[PDB]
Design a protein around this nucleic acid. Structure first.
Ligand SMILES: [Cl-]
Ligand SMILES: [Cl-]
Ligand SMILES: [Cl-]
Ligand SMILES: [Cl-]
Ligand SMILES: [Cl-]
Ligand SMILES: [Cl-]
Ligand SMILES: [Cl-]
Ligand SMILES: [Mg+2]
Ligand SMILES: [Mg+2]
Ligand SMILES: [Mg+2]
Ligand SMILES: [Mg+2]
Ligand SMILES: [Mg+2]
Ligand SMILES: [Mg+2]
Ligand SMILES: [Mg+2]
Ligand SMILES: [Mg+2]
Ligand SMILES: [Mg+2]
Ligand SMILES: [Mg+2]
Ligand SMILES: [Mg+2]
Ligand SMILES: [Mg+2]
Ligand code: NA
Ligand code: NA
Ligand code: NA
Ligand code: NA
Ligand code: NA
Ligand code: NA
Ligand code: NA
Ligand code: NA
Ligand code: NA
Ligand code: NA
Ligand code: NA
Ligand code: NA
Ligand SMILES: [Sr+2]
Ligand SMILES: [Sr+2]
Ligand SMILES: [Sr+2]
Ligand SMILES: [Sr+2]
Ligand SMILES: [Sr+2]
Ligand SMILES: [Sr+2]
Ligand SMILES: [Sr+2]
Ligand SMILES: [Sr+2]
Ligand SMILES: [Sr+2]
Lengths: 49, 150, 142, 142
RNA sequence: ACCCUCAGAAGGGAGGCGAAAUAGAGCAUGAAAUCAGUUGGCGAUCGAGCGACAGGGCAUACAAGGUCCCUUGACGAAUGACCGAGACGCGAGUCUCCAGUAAGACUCACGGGAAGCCGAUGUUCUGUCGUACGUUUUGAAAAACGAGCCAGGGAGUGUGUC
RNA sequence: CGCUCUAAUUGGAUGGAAGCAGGGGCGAGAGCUCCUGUGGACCGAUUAGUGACGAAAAUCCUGGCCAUAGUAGCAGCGAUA
């Protein structure tokens, strides 16, 4: 759940900004956003044997 | 802050510095540029004339909208930045004083080196229309001065 | 009173006629800079080579003046490729034991930068006695 | 005021364009040329159409400007400028080492360049530079 | 610490400590963008994808590169003469011989020379070519879309089955 | 080619490691390497592995910064001080 604990929403078109989910004026959740989720991180379910 | 950016033989020179001065950095570049190479005493007489309005300070770089001044030689734009001039007078007072305490003739020494550096901005905020605030900051200026025997 | 470099600093390797001809060719022909397209137009774009990928890229399409594109055709001659400009083949050395098996007639040795002044002194004296030139010698006051 | 020309060309009864072409190349070859008797230079064809073309050049213009000369003095000079890369360093040097004169300010007689001569006994359809300038409104100072 | 300066527990100067204060308080290191001062090159008659490749100017402590220039000679691919003699053509010019000769890129040797001298690096001048990049598109310099600049961040990963 | 960490084998460092700055050499190239200065404690190579491994772009994210500019504003309201 790292990076997913936020209700961040995107503003969409109209305000001259990229459609990136924001919360309190900060970009959140998405992998390209600082403090966002990790796109393809190490996974516990992976069989390492 | 800054450190003297030029070598200085302590046997023939005296130093001085201003720290984090809330004054125009742009006026400081102009003032330094103009008094460099002068005699400390000549600089003081000059800065006093500026503050008084008798002598203009050539604004060669930061001159957008600045009206011309007939007394500016070889250039057109000029002003009378009295605040920054007073700060420079303090600098010269300290330098000449240091010089004297070392056995030199302060006033007679040449301003070998003098340069202003923007050390930062004191941050401020100003409320604007439509529910937003914008920057409203104060420049923070350091300036070094090296008086040299000649 | 003056600075002098340790070792056989002026030593030259002995090359066959053909090797000397090819080394001389490599030095005459040279090669283009091979820097990334437009590296000069943007500070965030480094000089490091990247294949021009744009569908419309002028360099990719090969327009004259847009710089050469990396190709095998630009390779140096096999017989001399990688040689120091002197003609010597280089040998990376980290210690005295690394000097063993080195032919000072054909090879010259280069002491790794990490090696300290103490160890370099030994490596340098041992290399000279074996007739091996040290490409990066220590300059001592003599 | 004194022009040490290596060559002095007599334009009297000579085809303007043909002289201009030779003076251009000579100038590019480093020669300092002086075209004398400009007012007597000649251009072939129907006077009415020739004048119509030069008149249009005088009428063309705007804020940026298209200053076209009216005197035989400047007309010949301009004719030469059009055969020289006057915006390049080499071209400007050549053009600036060429001068056209009304009459002959020299003591010598100019030389008539080969192939530029026009025989009046064999031609009726031609106009003199001075004649064009008069029609254009230039004050006949020659 | 002490001393000087100053309206001054400010700051500055000098000084003391320490291997180091350019370790003196968001006080290990200290990139880029960028700013001040300054060095080199260019600069108030001249033109714009900013460059690539050639070639000139000016600039250059050492180190980590050491080559380079001229006479002559040797070698000498393709190519390839002048002059002269003889023969043609209205003419521009041509053929035959001289002769595949002289010449011919590179490379080497002898003799002489260069140390800002050769390379290289900075800048600038000349020549040739040249309307970014990425994307959308049949067609992009595009009056189609994206980006102010820099640093860092930023996209084929796991389980099961085939 | 380069990045992380693991293992085996084998090396470097206070007689100065990594990093950074400027500069020299090599490689078609990814990139490798040396010198000098700074820095002041860590760093490799080979081989077998591991992968949260490579950016110029996404009106991409965050931070820092320049021009804009000493520019707009610091006048306007029946309360001109
Ligand atoms: Cl400012
Ligand atoms: Cl290959
Ligand atoms: Cl006009
Ligand atoms: Cl031109
Ligand atoms: Cl006729
Ligand atoms: Cl060869
Ligand atoms: Cl893939
Ligand atoms: Mg996160
Ligand atoms: Mg104004
Ligand atoms: Mg409100
Ligand atoms: Mg760049
Ligand atoms: Mg620090
Ligand atoms: Mg891309
Ligand atoms: Mg369409
Ligand atoms: Mg091994
Ligand atoms: Mg990255
Ligand atoms: Mg941002
Ligand atoms: Mg404005
Ligand atoms: Mg009133
Ligand atoms: Na939360
Ligand atoms: Na934006
Ligand atoms: Na598992
Ligand atoms: Na004046
Ligand atoms: Na004036
Ligand atoms: Na004509
Ligand atoms: Na006109
Ligand atoms: Na140059
Ligand atoms: Na697109
Ligand atoms: Na495009
Ligand atoms: Na268009
Ligand atoms: Na902005
Ligand atoms: Sr809408
Ligand atoms: Sr300005
Ligand atoms: Sr080292
Ligand atoms: Sr000609
Ligand atoms: Sr001190
Ligand atoms: Sr031959
Ligand atoms: Sr990644
Ligand atoms: Sr600003
Ligand atoms: Sr008022």
């Amino acid at each position: 759940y790292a990076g997913l604990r936020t209700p961040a929403e995107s503003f969409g078109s109209g305000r001259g900004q990229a459609h990136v989910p924001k919360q309190d004026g900060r970009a959140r959740r998405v992998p390209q956003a600082v403090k966002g989720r990790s796109a393809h991180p190490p996974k516990t379910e992976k069989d390492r044997s | 802050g800054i450190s003297y950016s030029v070598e200085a033989d302590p046997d023939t020179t005296a130093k001085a510095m201003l720290r984090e001065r809330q004054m125009s950095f742009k006026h400081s570049k102009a003032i330094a540029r103009e008094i460099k190479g002068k005699t400390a005493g000549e600089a003081v007489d000059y800065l006093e004339a500026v503050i008084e309005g008798d002598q203009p300070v050539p604004f060669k770089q930061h001159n957008s909208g600045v009206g011309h001044k007939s007394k500016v030689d070889g250039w057109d734009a000029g002003r009378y930045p009295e605040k920054a001039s007073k700060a420079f007078l303090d600098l010269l007072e300290n330098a000449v004083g240091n010089a004297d305490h070392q056995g030199f003739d302060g006033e007679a020494m040449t301003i070998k080196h003098v340069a202003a550096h923007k050390v930062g901005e004191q941050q401020g905020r100003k409320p604007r229309a439509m529910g937003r605030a914008s920057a409203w900051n104060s420049p923070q200026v350091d300036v070094e001065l090296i008086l040299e025997e000649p | 009173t003056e600075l002098q470099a340790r070792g056989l600093t002026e030593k030259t390797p002995d090359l066959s006629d053909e090797d000397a001809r090819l080394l001389t060719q490599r030095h005459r022909v040279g090669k283009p800079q091979f820097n990334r397209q437009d590296h000069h137009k943007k500070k965030r774009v480094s000089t490091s080579w990247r294949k021009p990928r744009g569908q419309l890229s002028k360099q990719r399409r090969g327009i004259k003046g847009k710089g050469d594109t990396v190709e095998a055709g630009f390779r140096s001659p096999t017989a001399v490729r990688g040689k120091h400009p002197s003609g010597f083949e280089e040998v990376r050395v980290h210690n005295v034991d690394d000097l063993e098996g080195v032919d000072g007639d054909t090879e010259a040795v280069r002491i790794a930068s990490k090696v300290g002044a103490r160890k370099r002194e030994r490596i340098e004296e041992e290399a000279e006695d074996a007739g091996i030139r040290v490409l990066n010698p220590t300059y001592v006051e003599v | 005021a004194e022009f040490d020309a290596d060559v002095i060309v007599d334009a009297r009864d000579c085809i303007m364009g043909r002289v201009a072409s030779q003076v251009a190349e000579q100038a590019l070859d480093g020669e300092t040329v002086a075209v004398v008797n400009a007012e007597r230079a000649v251009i072939t064809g129907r006077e009415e159409q020739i004048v119509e073309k030069y008149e249009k050049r005088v009428d063309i213009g705007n804020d940026n400007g298209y200053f076209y000369p009216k005197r035989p003095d400047g007309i010949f000079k301009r004719t030469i400028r059009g055969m020289l890369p006057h915006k390049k360093q080499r071209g400007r040097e050549a053009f600036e080492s060429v001068r056209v004169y009304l009459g002959n300010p020299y003591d010598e007689d100019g030389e008539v360049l080969d192939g530029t001569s026009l025989d009046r006994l064999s031609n009726i359809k031609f106009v003199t530079l001075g004649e064009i300038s008069e029609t254009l409104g230039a004050n006949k100072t020659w």
